[PDB]
Design a protein around this ligand. Structure first.
Ligand SMILES: [Zn+2]
Length: 627
RNA sequence: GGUAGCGCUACC
RNA sequence: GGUAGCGCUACC
């Protein structure tokens, strides 16, 4: 498996010592080409060091076993990830090795760390290998690393590392023009300090009924200028926008009504994508888990519950599913020869369409074993899977145990399955990058491609940049570098201005649901510049410990996640605990509180935007004061 | 779970 | 530029 010609030509500018972006197609072999640059770099000098910056946890160990292990004959290589983080300090481990393969935020933490053993600098490395370098933009981690690289470069710093970008698609960044597509590429060159870009229904009475129920509730609200466009992204914005204002001002009738009206609008969007029965069970389980406001809204649903369940059972009113069933009936006979993936927008659509397959008479008979594949992220509406669960299902898919998937956009890019031969993009509305990447998952000879929906530049830009004059290129890039560093200082100063407005004691925290005051801003401390905990011992009266302890797949260095916590009076979710070494501490989520200040009452979503200074937590300080 | 990031759609 | 929804990701 010796290098090809195009690989050798692509790395040529990197070997001379220049900052480059190696643009090659997906799966051409950018990682093997990087290894050759790394060996040729480390062979050429002493005190040489490499940081390989991936952007996914799986890519740390993938690069090692597939590619970078070959370098171990001459040079020490070590892998650092999220899962194996808590054992050793990075500063020691990185300085002890010749090559360090890690997710970018590990290095960024090490670059900011206060502890001398965990500390690191940019000057400590002499070749950064930023894999998928096109992400180096805006306020991403990649870009914040490289933005410090530029701030130092422009202040007369020397011996900053060689930059080596790997990427398949630099992209446009939402630019359909030719003028804009070039300017986008010139910014990414300025971010990475790059010098040479190298390359080779008719009737819907279920839906119509749900709209009428929302009209009755908006009449009960008694308000003018409400939005009259039900079952839309505009309505879901406006109803939550009103719910946010109702929470800030504390208007109980408007706040409780707005939460329910969204649940009806969610059902309208669930009804549009998948079954009528899926839209019904969203509202069913909402009211089942449960003042005059909630009593009216409970009675409003109770009358329409029996009707909507009959309308959902009606087979006259989804044509999408009848179309989907005919594709599955045809292609999966013989029983389990084919191998398909069905792309959906939401996790709720993915989890619904699996249960549809199980509750259908025509498809049961053909041996189709299937499952759902989503991400590891999370929110209050929907939960996801994990990296361990995803990899089990991908294995069972690859070796023919399971032969169908209802996946989200998790696996549209990256997932290689040689035996796959079917793709069904179910009612999506994405760009042609997401379209062409989705088509490529079927790796088989005679690959099918269906686009199940309802009835009724970059390549030129890169070559234009590659063919620029050297003087014009260097004068443009130095302008864009000076721009971003000035934009950074303005944005950090502007953030510092808003942070120093009020005092900690002047700022009070209220419960988002019931508006009872609970604590002051002086009580709060940040643990690792992230977790905001109340150190006042009298705070423990206000929160109650609801459920058992939460379990993640990972372990941390200093602390571990305790039980959840809720409001003593109204049982609203506040956050969770932190069992920091030997002391419990209450973690707070800003989403579940209305922060009162001298000026205004606001419903903050981020802790970065708060208007009072918050000090760093000290374990030595808290133990001394409490004991 | 907590803190961020990005992409897509939608309105302002 | 602001916000919300959804999807993906990272660190802790
Ligand atoms: Zn409360």
């Amino acid at each position: 498996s010796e290098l090809h010609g195009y690989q050798l030509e692509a790395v040529a500018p990197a070997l001379r010592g220049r900052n480059s972006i190696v643009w090659l197609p997906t799966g051409a072999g950018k990682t093997r080409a990087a290894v050759h640059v790394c060996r040729r770099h480390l062979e050429g000098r002493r005190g040489g060091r490499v940081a390989v910056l991936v952007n996914k946890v799986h890519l740390v160990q993938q690069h090692l076993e597939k590619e970078f292990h070959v370098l171990r004959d001459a040079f020490k290589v070590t892998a650092v990830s999220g899962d194996s983080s808590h054992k050793c300090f990075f500063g020691q481990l990185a300085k002890g090795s010749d090559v360090v393969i890690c997710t970018a935020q590990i290095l960024q933490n090490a670059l900011l760390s206060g502890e001398e053993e965990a500390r690191v600098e940019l000057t400590d490395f002499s070749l950064l290998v930023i894999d998928e370098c096109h992400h180096t933009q805006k306020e991403a981690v990649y870009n914040k690393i490289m933005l410090s690289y530029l701030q130092k470069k422009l202040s007369g710093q020397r011996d900053l590392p060689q930059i080596l970008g790997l990427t398949a698609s630099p992209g446009t960044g939402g630019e359909t023009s030719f003028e804009g597509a070039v300017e986008h590429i010139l910014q990414i060159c300025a971010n990475l300090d790059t010098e040479v870009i190298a390359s080779a229904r008719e009737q819907d009475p279920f839906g119509q009924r749900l709209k009428k129920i929302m009209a009755q509730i908006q009449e009960h609200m008694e308000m003018p200028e409400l939005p009259q466009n039900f079952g839309t992204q505009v309505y879901e914005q406006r109803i939550v926008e009103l719910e946010n204002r109702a929470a800030e001002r504390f208007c109980r009738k408007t706040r409780v009504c707005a939460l329910h009206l969204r649940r009806y609008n969610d059902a309208l969007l669930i009804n549009d994508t998948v079954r009528m029965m899926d839209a019904f069970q969203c509202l069913q389980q909402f009211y089942a888990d449960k003042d005059p406001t909630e009593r009216f809204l409970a009675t409003t649903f109770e009358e329409n519950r029996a009707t909507l369940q009959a309308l959902a059972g009606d087979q006259r009113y989804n044509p999408r599913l009848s179309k989907l069933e005919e594709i599955l009936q045809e292609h999966f006979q013989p029983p389990g020869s084919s191998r398909g993936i069905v792309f959906t927008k939401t996790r709720q659509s993915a989890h619904s369409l699996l249960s549809w397959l199980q509750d259908t008479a025509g498809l049961c008979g053909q041996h189709i074993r299937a499952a759902v594949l989503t991400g590891s992220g999370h929110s209050n509406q929907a939960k996801g899977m994990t990296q361990n669960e995803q990899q089990d299902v991908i294995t069972l898919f690859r070796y023919g145990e399971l032969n169908l998937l209802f996946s989200t956009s998790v696996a549209e890019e990256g997932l290689d399955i040689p035996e796959c031969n079917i793709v069904v993009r179910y009612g999506l509305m994405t760009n042609e990058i997401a379209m062409v990447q989705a088509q490529g998952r079927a790796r088989a000879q005679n690959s099918m491609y269906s686009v199940l929906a309802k009835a009724n530049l970059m390549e030129r830009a890169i070559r234009a940049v590659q063919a620029m004059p050297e003087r014009k290129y260097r004068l443009k890039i130095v302008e864009l570098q000076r721009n971003a560093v000035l934009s950074w200082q303005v944005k950090e100063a502007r953030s510092s201005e808003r942070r120093q407005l009020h005092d900690p004691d002047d700022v009070y925290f209220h419960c988002v649901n019931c508006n009872v005051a609970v604590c002051r801003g002086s009580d709060i401390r940040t643990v690792e510049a992230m977790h905001h905990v109340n150190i006042n011992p009298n705070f423990r009266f206000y929160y109650t410990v609801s459920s058992g302890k939460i379990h993640f797949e990972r372990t941390f260095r200093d602390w571990e996640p305790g039980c959840r916590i809720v409001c003593s009076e109204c049982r609203q979710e506040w956050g969770m605990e932190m069992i920091y070494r030997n002391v419990t501490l209450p973690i707070l989520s800003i989403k579940n509180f209305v922060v009162v200040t001298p000026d205004e009452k606001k419903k903050y979503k981020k802790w970065s935007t708060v208007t009072f200074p918050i000090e760093e937590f000290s374990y030595l300080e808290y133990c001394s004061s409490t004991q």
